[PDB]
Design an enzyme around this catalytic site. Structure first.
Site, short mmCIF file in Angstrom:
data_model
loop_
_atom_site.label_atom_id
_atom_site.label_comp_id
_atom_site.label_asym_id
_atom_site.label_seq_id
_atom_site.Cartn_x
_atom_site.Cartn_y
_atom_site.Cartn_z
N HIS A 14 57.09 45.14 25.86
CA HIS A 14 55.70 45.29 25.42
C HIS A 14 55.67 45.49 23.91
CE1 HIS A 14 57.01 49.46 25.63
NE2 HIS A 14 55.90 49.87 25.06
N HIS A 49 54.59 47.59 21.57
CA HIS A 49 54.40 48.86 20.89
C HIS A 49 55.45 49.03 19.80
CE1 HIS A 49 51.91 51.40 24.02
NE2 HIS A 49 51.16 50.60 23.29
N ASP A 108 57.60 51.20 19.08
CA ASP A 108 58.94 51.69 19.37
C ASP A 108 59.79 50.71 20.17
OD1 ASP A 108 56.99 52.30 21.38
OD2 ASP A 108 58.37 53.73 22.31
N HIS A 109 59.30 49.50 20.44
CA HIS A 109 60.13 48.53 21.14
C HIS A 109 60.05 47.17 20.47
CE1 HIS A 109 60.70 51.64 24.16
NE2 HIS A 109 59.39 51.84 24.11
N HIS A 115 51.21 49.97 31.27
CA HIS A 115 51.61 50.63 30.04
C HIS A 115 50.97 49.94 28.83
CE1 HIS A 115 54.04 53.29 27.63
NE2 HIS A 115 54.54 52.27 26.96
N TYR A 155 47.05 58.56 28.70
CA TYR A 155 45.96 57.61 28.89
C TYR A 155 44.83 58.24 29.68
CZ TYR A 155 49.38 53.91 27.70
OH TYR A 155 50.32 53.09 27.12
N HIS A 187 63.10 52.66 27.57
CA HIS A 187 63.65 53.98 27.34
C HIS A 187 64.72 54.19 28.39
CE1 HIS A 187 60.74 55.29 24.31
NE2 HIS A 187 59.87 54.58 25.00
#
Lengths: 266, 266, 266, 266
Positions: D83, D85, D87-88, D159, D190, D224
């Site tokens: 995805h 975001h 952090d990825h 997510h 969320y 993660h």
């Protein structure tokens, strides 16, 4: 010795390009496109909404009809789309330039619109049009509100991955009229089975039939008026033979199931 | 009662669409386009560079010629452009998809390429093509290097705002050959004076003549080979009558000054 | 054993983030930004124009000040930019979403804005902000008109490749006031000589000094008010010490020439 | 008198930023990210594939690890994403610039990636990163093949709307190992019920649990590592406690159902 082939234009039936005067659908909703291409103008206290625009060459005609309705170019606030093919989203780029309108669409429609319909899952580059950018990305079920009129998106993937039905409630006399503007449920010439570019095409169509069946609807309209048995050319009798959502979905599914069997057979 | 006009395709002279086998320009540089559209393949130890691609339908022919040169689709590293019109940047989108190549271009070329040539300053939407994204934005004078071959950008605005000449040094026998691939300096049908969409058009052309005059150049090539008196069809005599940069710029400026006077006179 | 460094935020002087009430510049032009970041609201009979927005967190303050001026969010028609750095174009994305405004900018500003200031020629990714799309691409000298007020673009590359000065004519009492909103002419920490990402940086700056000198101007304003000796905090005396265009360009060029000599010396 | 707040950076746990040497997952698959951020390198005869990249500052570390594996920057052919975001997908823009790789992603991931994570459905602009463009748009179930290794996309919205699980078959000893790289199934902070920006959030999560349960899988990995009970820091015992797809989906759904009840209760 043979040269490469010339580019071919996307030519369509003359009736798709036949201008018509505005035809009232409900108290605030008007057909302002051509005889065989729907373009819906919804007029609010705070500006106008356009659902679809037809072919690229229809931009000037749409603005003429808006002017007939008292809507100046700058008064168009928002453009919504059924799907981002050249025959329904064709003039969006020019309309944005000439009106200041914003476009709201789901992510699939946005990316197809942004490449002007090129690299289509089924049509390749055969049906391109001037690219346009989506200003607001819409999610399934999200409500877009202009002038107190609430438009709800219902995703119905199939005809395109981003195909969307839009619903809102107008009035006629003093009674509410739930309008449903549903995209096409046809698969014109598509490879349905084992399509590498659309592996879940059949599942999405199957789900979209059921989505259309359950839409809140008193009056169904479609991007091609004949798909829901409208006849824009006959004025106030234009809606007389219009299909229900159930009849539209039923007929689409029977057509789909036949085409699927005929693909197994060639 | 007359319907709106059909869309018209961008049709061109058959010679623009006439395939040719690769024609060697220097030790690593080949013409691999058509008889009347330049597309230059430069082959390095670490992949190939393509300068221009011609018309949209030329994608498959370009890949065939690359294969003839020992360049697999994945071996094409970079696409560079003279300008982002349909007849020179036409197949870039498809080429990126089929090769993994990146496109480097200046900001003006990038934004025109990204809208597929639509909303052209002079041609409107009459000459569109599948949009493509630029992966690296180039500045005037910036050097792009692939396999130790350095390509320098020289901005020459006019024909398009983003028009670029590209220079690099190849070899022939064991002597260096400074190649200059210069964009068109024509203004075909443009309104030159007081053009609202291009107010400094005349100043930019005037400056671009002088830029082309001063390019480092032993061998000039142009997107339309006839503009620099190349004749791709005659094999090893193709470069015999080629213009210098000075003669090319001189002739363009005399043509420009005439057209300007004829615009004052109608 | 040492982890990678954390991301660092773009923090600025508190005065850049100090809200101020609208400060009138001329009959239709107001400073509505912060004490040390210019954001100019120009009010017309047919909607408002915003020139620059400051930092990303200034979006809500800008809308509050617009409301103070009688401008509803939907009344903002157009956003113009000096350059697409985070401290002057920071809130453009949010402003477009909340107002329906369109952005007009030249191609360089458009491509930097579209990547949110990332991959800056000098600052890399250190100063990013939410990306936004340009709705109209502007050429040097092009006139953008809203409500009969004509804004002319004057390209002044250097601080950014797309840096633009905007001019228009307001009134004060009953006499015309030619306003010039000129971008920065500084090169804060830039490598000036032999910069691979900007090979003609010195030439562009040199030309931009002369462009600023010749702007039609009775009242100069700059994105950082101190650059033209404005003091927004002192109300009606804010413009008292304002520089002319000549004095602004002169001072910038002397600063530039010093920095250039100090780069030769380290 | 209080100034507007400064921008805040996206800071993360140090373990997310703790470099690690390449850790072999199967014959051609390696973890090359940090201790607590997965980044999977798959090496083929015709170039390498990267699934996810972690945080923006991880670009250089990823290239170092690729080099350790014999993969030069130019050898990276393709980037795939769980995805978009920060952090990825944080370093994707820089990685494209430095490698020539193409990005394939579904339309939702593409539009979020293209705005650098800004205007997130839940996080607003709090977690932005340098925008990048998707070169190939992927549909649910579509197969992407590099060097004879086939990667299949399985959409698992929740997510993020574009969240995707990727599956492929590697080998270990001489036996096949079906790897499943599944996105997060968490909803961290969320609003689940009646979320205007995501009206069908609950339905999509519910469907995505069942999608993950049915993935072809002998070895599950997650962006993660702790989400699937990997421990990258312990070398060859890193996979020992890894969850099955069923256990991962089960645990996610119980966590989701609890959070949903706690939202009804505040």
């Amino acid at each position: 010795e043979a040269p490469l082939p010339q580019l071919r234009a996307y030519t369509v039936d003359a009736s798709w390009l036949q201008p018509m005067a505005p035809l009232q659908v409900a108290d605030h909703t008007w057909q302002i496109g051509t005889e065989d291409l729907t373009a819906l103008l919804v007029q609010t206290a705070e500006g106008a909404v356009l659902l679809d625009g037809g072919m690229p060459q229809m931009a000037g005609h749409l603005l003429d009809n808006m002017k007939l309705r008292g809507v100046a170019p700058q008064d168009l606030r928002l453009i919504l789309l059924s799907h981002a093919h050249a025959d329904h989203a064709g003039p969006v780029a020019e309309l944005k330039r000439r009106t200041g309108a914003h476009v709201a669409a789901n992510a699939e429609t946005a990316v197809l619109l942004a490449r002007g319909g090129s690299n289509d899952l089924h049509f390749g580059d055969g049906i391109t049009y001037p690219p346009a950018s989506a200003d607001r990305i819409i999610m399934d079920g999200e409500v877009v509100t202009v002038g107190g009129i609430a438009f709800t998106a219902h995703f119905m993937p199939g005809h395109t991955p981003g195909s969307t039905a839009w619903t809102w409630t107008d009035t006629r006399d003093g009674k509410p009229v739930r309008i449903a503007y549903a995209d096409s449920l046809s698969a014109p010439g598509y490879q349905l089975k084992g399509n590498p570019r659309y592996p879940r095409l059949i599942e999405d169509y199957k789900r979209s039939f059921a989505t259309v069946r359950a839409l809140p609807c008193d009056l169904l309209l479609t991007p091609h008026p004949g798909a829901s048995n409208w006849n824009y050319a006959v004025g106030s009798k234009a809606s007389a033979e219009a299909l229900t959502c159930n009849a539209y979905a039923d007929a689409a599914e029977k057509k789909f199931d036949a085409q699927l069997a005929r693909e197994t057979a060639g």
